[PDB]
Scaffold this active site. Structure first.
Site, PDB file in Angstrom:
ATOM      1  N   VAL A 293       3.379  -8.701  -2.556  1.00 13.92           N
ATOM      2  CA  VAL A 293       4.612  -9.441  -2.244  1.00 13.92           C
ATOM      3  C   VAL A 293       4.222 -10.635  -1.380  1.00 13.92           C
ATOM      4  CG1 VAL A 293       7.035  -9.366  -1.431  1.00 13.92           C
ATOM      5  CG2 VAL A 293       5.982  -7.294  -2.346  1.00 13.92           C
TER       6      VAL A 293
ATOM      7  N   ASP B  39      12.933   5.541  -1.011  1.00 16.31           N
ATOM      8  CA  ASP B  39      11.909   5.206  -0.035  1.00 16.31           C
ATOM      9  C   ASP B  39      12.493   4.356   1.113  1.00 16.31           C
ATOM     10  OD1 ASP B  39       9.360   5.313   1.132  1.00 16.31           O
ATOM     11  OD2 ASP B  39       8.616   3.584  -0.042  1.00 16.31           O
TER      12      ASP B  39
END
Ligand SMILES: CN(C)C(=O)c1cc2cnc(Nc3ccc(N4CCNCC4)cn3)nc2n1C1CCCC1
Length: 261
Positions: A17, A118
């Site tokens: 990312v 998550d």
């Protein structure tokens, strides 16, 4: 190219990312994520979720043709917000507001059949103006926020995120994680030491780990671990940290809880 990568956000076993300059849109910052080669389905679920532009979920700006994901960029996650807050910590009503926003984005996601799976302070974004945004969900390690049923390998329904939310709620007061386990068996142990051993009827069938593998006697009072919590916040925290995911409070019911009177 339309985007110039400036930094790496974190490092996740989901792929790299990048924080990037959006050269075409005023040189604003964007979060760029690349996907390799049901995945088509996930991206469509994400684009569909974006149509609602819910205030408490990270904005998806674009999808580029293997496949690159452009999101808005936000400077801090909840971790860096709890690490930088001046003593004695986070204002009582700042915790209330942030939790309401967390459950708002959560109920939005759950009602649209999306399970985060998550949820942790590392993927909760905290905006310059104090807005809470859910990120890094709906796409195919720390167990500190892992629900008991995920640990046991039995069910993976929406209650999974309400256990996570309870862990985050406590951590907002403490500024340290409530259950800092090092393995699934350790994590489950550290949990049962605080909430107590559940009834045999609340223990999942046909799981590897029997109830008898733990002897974490009684439920300790939660105020011992979460100092400064009010009576109403204690009811909501207990309802989130319920063993049986069927008995666990939903994000929808939690929004109506007296804690947010
Ligand atoms: C890319 N995808 C799918 C998203 O949903 C997404 C959209 C995002 C927008 N802004 C950020 N900001 C951000 C978040 C965490 C950290 N920290 C990393 C840990 N150490 C402290 C600093 C630093 N900056 N992250 C985004 N993400 C993800 C959330 C988790 C990482 C990438």
């Amino acid at each position: 190219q339309q985007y110039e990568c400036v930094a790496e956000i974190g490092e996740g076993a989901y792929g790299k990312v990048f924080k990037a300059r959006d050269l075409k849109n005023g040189g604003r910052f964007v979060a760029l994520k690349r996907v390799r080669v049901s995945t088509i389905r996930e991206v469509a679920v994400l684009r569909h979720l974006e149509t609602f532009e819910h205030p408490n979920v990270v904005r998806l700006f674009d999808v580029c043709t293997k496949l690159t994901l452009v999101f808005e960029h936000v400077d801090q996650d909840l971790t860096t917000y709890l690490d930088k807050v001046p003593e004695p910590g986070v204002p009582t009503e700042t915790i209330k507001d942030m939790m309401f926003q967390l459950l708002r984005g959560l109920d939005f996601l759950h009602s649209h059949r999306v399970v985060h799976r998550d949820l942790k302070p590392q993927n909760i974004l905290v905006t310059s103006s104090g807005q809470i945004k859910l990120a890094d969900f709906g796409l195919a390690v720390t167990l500190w926020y892992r629900a008991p049923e995920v640990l046991l390998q039995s069910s993976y329904a929406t209650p999974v995120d309400l256990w996570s939310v309870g862990c985050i709620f406590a951590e907002m007061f403490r500024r340290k994680p409530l259950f800092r386990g090092s393995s699934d068996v350790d994590q489950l142990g550290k949990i049962l030491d605080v909430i107590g051993l559940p009834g045999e009827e609340d223990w999942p069938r046909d799981v590897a780990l029997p109830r008898q593998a733990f002897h974490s006697k009684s439920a300790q009072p939660i105020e011992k671990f979460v100092t400064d919590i009010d009576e109403l916040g204690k009811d909501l925290l207990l309802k989130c940290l319920t063993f049986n995911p069927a008995k666990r409070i939903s994000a929808y019911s939690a929004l109506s809880h007296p804690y947010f009177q």
